[PDB]
Amino acid sequence: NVMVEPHRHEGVFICDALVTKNLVPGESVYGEKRVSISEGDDKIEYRAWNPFRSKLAAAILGGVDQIHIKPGAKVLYLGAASGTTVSHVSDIVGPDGLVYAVEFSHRSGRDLINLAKKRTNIIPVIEDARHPHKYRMLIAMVDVIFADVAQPDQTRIVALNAHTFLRNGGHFVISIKANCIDSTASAEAVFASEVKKMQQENMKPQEQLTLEPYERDHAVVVGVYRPPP
Helix, strand or coil: CCCCEECCCCCEEECCCEEEECCCCCCCCCCCCEEEEEECCEEEEEEECCCCCCHHHHHHHCCCCCCCCCCCCEEEEECCCCCHHHHHHHHHHCCCCEEEEECCCHHHHHHHHHHHHHCCCEEEECCCCCCHHHCHHHCCCEEEEEECCCCCCHHHHHHHHHHHHEEEEEEEEEEEEHHHHHCCCCHHHHHHHHHHHHHHCCEEEEEEEECCCCCCCEEEEEEEECCCC
């Protein structure tokens, strides 16, 4: 019998409970259940990925077609907060991948620094994502931008970082909480507005989905950056 099986998305696994292969066997990050499977000389530990705490997990269980975060990927994560979702991105991309974890708050910043001590593939960037000039000498060109900044001007911020850092034909994964962008617009009016802005900055949405039952009026938009010459 196979307990934990590869998910469709490479680097992800399903036990329906989503899990990622633990980069730091023995350690939990936010009190998540851990599941170690030993057979003979082999051994592999997984980490439970809670969809009520991670918008990315909620999107995966909601049936998103692509996440682009994959083994070996270079990921710029905007809005890294304390590292909950970032820790699972770190598992997915693996030792040959890279996760830049940008977060403004220095409180969450300290949780991120502790998380990165264990995970070599995390770079904490405790800076304001509005001003990429302050940190662009630290960021090699990335394959994916994941954004969860939760601001009304989130999309311009994300686009500013994509212009600087995202490779052509690179992808983005943007989490949009409607009442943080504009609590007096309907969720459909926010999502349509934000998707339009993306398209105007050559961030071409390829798919979108909401996150019920885990979150209300919360969308994830996945797409591709195809900038001009």
